[PDB]
Amino acid sequence: RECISIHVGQAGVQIGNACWELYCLEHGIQPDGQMPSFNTFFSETGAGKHVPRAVFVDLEPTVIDEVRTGTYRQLFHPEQLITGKEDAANNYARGHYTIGKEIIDLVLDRIRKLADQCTGLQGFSVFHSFGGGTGSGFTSLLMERLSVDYGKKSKLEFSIYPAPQVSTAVVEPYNSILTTHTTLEHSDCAFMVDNEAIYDICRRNLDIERPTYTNLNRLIGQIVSSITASLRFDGALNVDLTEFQTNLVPYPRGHFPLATYAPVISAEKAYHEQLSVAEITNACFEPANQMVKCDPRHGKYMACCLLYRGDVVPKDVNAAIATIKTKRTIQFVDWCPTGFKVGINYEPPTVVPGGDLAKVQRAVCMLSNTTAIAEAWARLDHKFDLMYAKRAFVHWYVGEGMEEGEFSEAREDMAALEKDYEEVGVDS
């Protein structure tokens, strides 16, 4: 019943920092590993120290060093903290090939070591970003190997969705297009969120006009914990990760369920307001709490999964579902009946001490696969196209051995993906 977390790149690792901090908060784990009390994620020592079963990869020492100098440096095993010396430079060509390919063997052997520590490997999940060099480059490299060795294990990916308006990486389209090509075909499911959309959540629901990544990742951590800690904890409907895959992936392509999370409420907003299960789920179908800037009303739904924490009675859930099925404007694709996975954990929602979110007594996470995602690809299509037509920055990949045909090909694969969304949109 075990799983592995993999943190690649800054985004992967810094999100991971929040994630493991939250898992410590879930059980009262001390920075040194001492836990007085979740062995699906952790491995126990004779001292009662538990080791989070995870791998941290950075090709630049700095971020891992940040871990190594922080409080959780005692928690993590030195072998889990893997670092190279040089970067990918925002570039798949080095991340996947030239540079990252050198260290990956080590990385894999640490993974395999942990796989041998697992007794019942259920699977794993990889945290990264769609635009970066290691964030997406190295990441796909890893998938190429992991899908061989662990072909039957859960291969869930979580990635930051490139913001349409702000991006620090000029060749991000190129990176992301190459990842599509290589991740679609290897991964089982990839989830993503938009930091821009999140900012809007922070300013509207948390009332914060100063979000940093350390805020943004707390919110992400909430979502992740709902599906990682609480799915291993007790509930009414205990849903596994493999079950998630078995209930969220409808086609052999990928699919890309997007996250939505409600409650996201400031302490003051929690006052004077009573949420019910149904009210929270109402919020879950509002564009306003959509974690990716993509309009839910534009597309049609294919999948939807609702996962519940704390004070949730199935009775209320059932009523809530009835209304979301019938009251809303949620259009859905023919193919699908509304079999929405309901996970119901008794495990209460948790809050980070010193965080922004209010203590809540119940909480709902929503995953959804909508046809509007093709518009996200359309965004990438043109951004890629523009650059590629001019061949701007192309020498930074070509010099590492990339082929122009390959890039065209990858775009075409994306186009095919868009076409398949088109297909799904056609009802039948």
């Binding site: 019943r1 019942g120 259920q122 291993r232 007790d234 009414a236 409907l237 205990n238 596994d240 493999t242 079950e243 998630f244 895959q245 078995t246 209930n247 992936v249 409808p250 086609y251 052999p252 294919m302 999948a303 009675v313 199935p314 009775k315 859930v317 059932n318 579902i321 009835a322 099925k325 694709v333 023919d334 193919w335 699908c336 009946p337 509304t338 079999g339 929405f340 996975k341 309901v342 039948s428």
Partner: protein, 426 residues
């Protein structure tokens, strides 16, 4: 004379958690395993569900099955999880994930061999089995998927024993798995012809009853599964305890099945009303019959007056006159003659037990076989078709090797049950 019960899936495991609790209540058996009752009858027929182990320990004759230790653990952690022996916990590791293919066709299939071995060990422990009962969900992976597989093998080993099952039927409003109708369709395809009878429980209907007549605003599944166990326990106790009428499960099965393929049941229960009104209720046979006939007191989301009634069983617990029961059942038949099928004269049958359920003076269990049941099948079949055309999540299933033509045949078979209900609906 004895019964073996097997629970599977998170649903089945949690239902059974209440079922066994009740059975031990009925007999005065402590959560730790020993007998501390106080009635002769309490031990007298205990054999049907318990093995007395050395030390005056009673072992529930049941197997708990799952593919995740944590659910099993939670069951074990409560009272009455200690009464089960470790050997009755058969489980694997890695879910099923609510996937029929995994449950039945592939992975769960692997576990079934160990389950069956224990089943065999218990079949030997019994003197003479009357039958087997299984608890599960129709749209679940281990509930239906693995559970079905097991049933086909048990039936094979014991053609001469009663094979029935109670199962949670996907409610129109709350499906959890997107392909819950798919799993259900496949289970019909397998179960119907591999079972003697199956009961149809709708959670939605149950939630309506709990608020509608019981006026409760906090139930959980444990409270609703209490109601489920009331009907299950109602059936077998009579068989166990002294009564007036004819107290044999097989005979019940014989009286309720007019046709080899149409064996689906609508359970209902009386009395079943809030405490406020309990000060304004009278306890008579007509009172129970009013609650029994009323569709709102059915636990299945069907409407018996929409369809036609093929068979009705009225089981009574506690001291009642024979006359009164006979007359009121006749009256029911008379007044609701428009719903009964004309081919069966006196279509309402009775069974009478003289032991009341603990705490009540009297009670009654409604079991029906109407044509109305077909409506549930119709809802599923339709939903199925849509999904079938799109192959939603079928890559998960076909990825594990489930073939679409098998599913095609499953669809037909659903439609066949509907057409046969039409054939006898007339």
């Amino acid at each position: 004379r004895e019964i073996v019960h097997i629970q599977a899936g998170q649903c089945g495991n949690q239902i059974g958690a209440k079922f066994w609790e009740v059975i031990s209540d009925e007999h005065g058996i402590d959560p730790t395993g020993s007998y501390h009752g106080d009635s002769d009858l309490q031990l007298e027929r205990i054999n049907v569900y318990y093995n007395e182990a050395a030390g005056n320990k009673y072992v529930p004759r049941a197997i708990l099955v799952d593919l995740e230790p944590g659910t099993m653990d939670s069951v074990r952690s409560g009272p009455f999880g200690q009464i089960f022996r470790p050997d009755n916990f058969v489980f694997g590791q890695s879910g099923a994930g609510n996937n029929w293919a995994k449950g039945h066709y592939t992975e769960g299939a692997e576990l079934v061999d160990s389950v069956l071995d224990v089943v065999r060990k218990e079949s030997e422990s019994c003197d003479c089995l009357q039958g087997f009962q299984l608890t599960h969900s129709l749209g679940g992976g281990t509930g239906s998927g693995m559970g079905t597989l097991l049933i086909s093998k048990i039936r094979e080993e014991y053609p001469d024993r009663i094979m029935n099952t109670f199962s949670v039927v996907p409610s129109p409003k709350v499906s959890d798995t997107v392909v819950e109708p798919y799993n259900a369709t496949l289970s019909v395809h397998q179960l119907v012809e591999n079972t003697d009878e199956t009961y149809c429980i709708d959670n939605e209907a149950l939630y309506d009853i709990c608020f509608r007549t019981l006026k409760l605003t906090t139930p959980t599944y444990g409270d609703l599964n209490h109601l489920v166990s009331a009907t299950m326990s109602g059936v077998t106790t009579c068989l166990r305890f002294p009564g007036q009428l004819n107290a044999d499960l097989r005979k019940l099965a014989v009286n309720m099945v007019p046709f080899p393929r149409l064996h689906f049941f609508m359970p209902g229960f009386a009395p079943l009303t809030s405490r406020g009104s309990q000060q304004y209720r009278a306890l008579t046979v007509p009172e129970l019959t009013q609650q029994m006939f009323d569709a709102k007191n059915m636990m299945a989301a069907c409407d018996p007056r929409h369809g036609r009634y093929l068979t009705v069983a009225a089981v009574f617990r506690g001291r009642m006159s024979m006359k009164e029961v006979d007359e009121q059942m006749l009256n029911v038949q008379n007044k609701n003659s428009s719903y009964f099928v004309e081919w069966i004269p006196n279509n309402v049958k009775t069974a009478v037990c003289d032991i009341p359920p603990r705490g009540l003076k009297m009670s009654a269990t409604f079991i029906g076989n109407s044509t109305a049941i077909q409506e549930l099948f119709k809802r599923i079949s339709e939903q199925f078709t849509a999904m079938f055309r799109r192959k939603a999540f079928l890559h998960w299933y076909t990825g594990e090797g489930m073939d679409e033509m098998e599913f095609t045949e499953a669809e037909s078979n659903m439609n066949d049950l509907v057409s046969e209900y039409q054939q006898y609906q007339d």
